[PDB]
């Protein structure tokens, strides 16, 4: 399922979704939200996070070739602890997206 | 938009049984589909989900390691592989659609609105 | 996480208000969904994202949200509005869905 990782520093950075809603307009909703999400990530900047914590994070994805809640949790745990050990106090990893593709996307606000 | 079960009747315990859910009507890739059963005189009970948007699968504990899911997109059909087969799995066995999208942060169901007519497995000697 | 619906089963005349709640149990949600089954039928679904009314379903069903407490109206009740009521709970990342035990609405007449 997730082959692939990236982080990316976003602190600009949730949907009030249209009523009855028709069949092509749920569809256009998802390609509304794929399109600005390809966007989010071509603006936004990478993470502090280093090499090593980047191939730490891959190795916990190919370790069970398959993403879930927990997964995500445990990668968040990660994340804000090397940031927090760093020196970034009040870094957050705000989010995971791009979940409908081979590559997790996490989200994190650095700060300081 | 339908949804058709298929592949129920009789097995012994610890048989096998595969059952198939013909969706027709719409586009299988935003949609996931979901087996939900209800035993005679019980309530309904998730069994499990496949999306294919997502290309994930779920699982409810009760049938974790016996039941596979699994779809044949091009077929627009779902499957439910039933192994190692009990007594208490003997119900009526209905699939449903769910377009569903999700983040980490949050997500958003327009619920199960398609659902089958059902088709029963019996588990007994 | 559980799904706990109130009452087990309730009676009630035609032209009646029926109220059924459901909690969720041991997390938070925003996901609730509301279903509708008779005896031996695949269940019709009623409300989604709690509030949200479906495709036909007559505006007498109405659904409310206080926190983790999730509530489904029936304003004039019907007589063939008998059957089992269910919440479903949907959360992220395709987590195992929930569905409430069920809440029985017989006809008083």
């Known amino acids: 399922r997730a082959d692939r990782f990236r982080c990316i520093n976003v602190g600009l950075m949730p949907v009030e979704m249209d009523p009855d809603m028709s069949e092509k307009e749920k569809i256009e909703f998802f390609r509304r939200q794929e399109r600005e999400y390809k966007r989010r990530i071509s603006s936004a900047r990478p993470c502090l996070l280093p090499t090593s914590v980047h191939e730490e994070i891959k190795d916990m994805l190919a370790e069970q070739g398959r993403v879930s809640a927990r997964l995500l949790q445990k990668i968040r745990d990660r994340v804000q602890s090397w940031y927090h050990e760093e020196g970034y106090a009040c870094a957050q990893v705000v989010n995971f997206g791009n979940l409908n593709t081979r590559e997790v996307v996490c989200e994190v606000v650095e700060g300081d | 938009v339908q949804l058709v079960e298929s592949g129920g009747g009789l097995v012994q315990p610890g048989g096998s049984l595969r059952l198939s859910c013909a969706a027709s009507?719409?586009?299988?890739?935003?949609?996931?589909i979901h087996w939900v059963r209800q035993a005679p005189g019980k309530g309904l009970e998730w069994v499990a989900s496949?999306?294919?948007?997502?290309?994930?699968?779920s699982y409810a504990d009760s049938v974790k390691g016996r039941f596979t899911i699994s779809a044949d997109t091009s077929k627009n059909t779902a499957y439910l592989q039933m192994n190692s087969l009990r007594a208490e799995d003997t119900a009526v066995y209905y699939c449903?659609?769910?377009?569903?999208?999700?983040?980490?942060?949050?997500?958003?169901?327009?619920?199960?609105?398609?659902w089958g007519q059902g088709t029963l497995v019996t588990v007994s000697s | 996480i559980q799904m706990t619906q109130s009452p087990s089963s309730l009676s009630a005349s035609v032209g009646d208000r029926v109220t059924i709640t459901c909690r969720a149990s041991q997390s938070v949600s925003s996901a609730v969904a509301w279903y509708q089954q008779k005896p031996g039928k695949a269940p019709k679904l009623l409300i989604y994202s709690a509030s949200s009314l479906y495709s036909g379903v007559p505006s007498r069903f109405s659904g409310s949200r206080s926190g983790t407490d999730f509530t489904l109206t029936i304003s004039s009740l019907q007589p063939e509005d008998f059957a089992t009521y269910y919440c479903?709970?949907?959360?992220?990342?395709?987590?195992?869905?929930?569905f409430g035990q069920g809440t029985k609405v017989e006809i008083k007449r």
């Open positions: 449903a659609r769910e377009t569903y999208y999700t983040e980490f942060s949050w997500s958003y169901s327009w619920g199960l609105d398609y």
């Open positions: 479903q709970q949907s959360s992220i990342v395709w987590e195992p869905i929930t």
């Open positions: 009507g719409f586009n299988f890739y935003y949609s996931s």
């Open positions: 496949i999306s294919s948007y997502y290309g994930s699968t």
